[PDB]
Write a protein that binds this ligand. Structure first.
Ligand SMILES: [Ca+2]
Ligand code: NA
Lengths: 252, 28, 10
């Protein structure tokens, strides 16, 4: 996260780290959506232009963390993956359309003060909150600058941008399965996701029922925190029929 | 049933340092 | 740079 700040303890208890087993390293973010299911970006798991294709046994998920590098004894939990599910229409060749994946854990994780799932939006949630100017929150342990790494989880709040402005910022074809967020040059405030933040959540707190909803997944951007560029996020509600199909077919 | 309600915040009626910024943006 | 985690997890 560029131009963010340190998270408070327990501020994002659905935050998940994806951790490469060997070499031991941060791969991406993710989010806890139930005791057995973790949501991330497909490009964190499958991206052929970089010879990335992870299988279940290549990875671990770390839940409940605050420190980036510490083993947080008696706080974090480390879970093994049973199975990865990537959206069958994930478009890695062109623009990362449908950049979404699910990971089923081998065993359920116990909730705690530090480990708790986020809600997924329904149609009305999305209609009420996904509006230009409304702010959401992005969290992660990715880099602090485009060209180091944080001691603790970072957080930044960012406004959703008008679709024609998002489209006019890039040569990439923007689909209805994406939205963008970030400040405009003239707004003077700053912030963005950066390398290592991908797969993490973009959340909003409903003012109607006081709950946090994951509206987006950190998907892609053109550099980090560049003036006139925006971050792009997978539109979770637009892909919920797939989410539910997978959990309904394979959950226990 | 309890999704999205944080043990150290909503389920103690404590606010985090910047959630009000989000609320203030949900104007209309 | 990352602190080593318990062996049981690997
Ligand atoms: Ca364009
Ligand atoms: Na920008």
């Amino acid at each position: 996260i560029v131009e963010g700040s340190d998270a408070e303890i327990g501020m994002s208890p659905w935050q998940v780290m994806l951790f490469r087993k060997s070499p031991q390293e941060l791969l991406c973010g993710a989010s806890l959506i139930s005791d057995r299911w973790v949501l991330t970006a497909a490009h964190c798991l499958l991206y052929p232009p970089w010879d990335k294709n992870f299988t279940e046994n290549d990875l671990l998920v770390r839940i409940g963390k605050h420190s980036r590098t510490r083993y947080e004894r008696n706080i974090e939990k480390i879970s093994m993956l049973e199975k990865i599910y990537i959206h069958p229409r994930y478009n890695w060749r062109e623009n990362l359309d449908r950049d979404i994946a699910l990971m089923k854990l081998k065993k359920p994780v116990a909730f705690s003060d530090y480990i708790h799932p986020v809600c997924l939006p329904d149609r009305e949630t999305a209609a009420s909150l996904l509006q230009a100017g409304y702010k959401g929150r992005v969290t992660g342990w990715g880099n602090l600058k485009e060209t180091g790494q944080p001691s603790v989880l970072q957080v930044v709040n960012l406004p959703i941008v008008e679709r024609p402005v998002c489209k006019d910022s890039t040569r990439i074809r923007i689909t209805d399965n994406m939205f963008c967020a970030g400040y405009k040059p003239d707004e003077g405030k700053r912030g963005d996701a950066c390398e290592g933040d991908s797969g993490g959540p973009f959340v909003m707190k409903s003012p109607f029922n006081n709950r946090w909803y994951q509206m987006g997944i950190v998907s892609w951007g053109e550099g980090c925190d560049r003036d006139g560029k925006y971050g792009f996020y997978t539109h979770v509600f637009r892909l919920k029929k797939w989410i539910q199909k997978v959990i309904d077919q394979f959950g226990e | 049933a309890d999704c999205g309600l944080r043990p150290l915040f909503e389920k103690k009626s404590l606010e985090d340092k910047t959630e009000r910024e989000l609320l203030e943006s949900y104007i209309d | 740079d990352f602190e080593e985690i318990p062996e049981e997890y690997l």
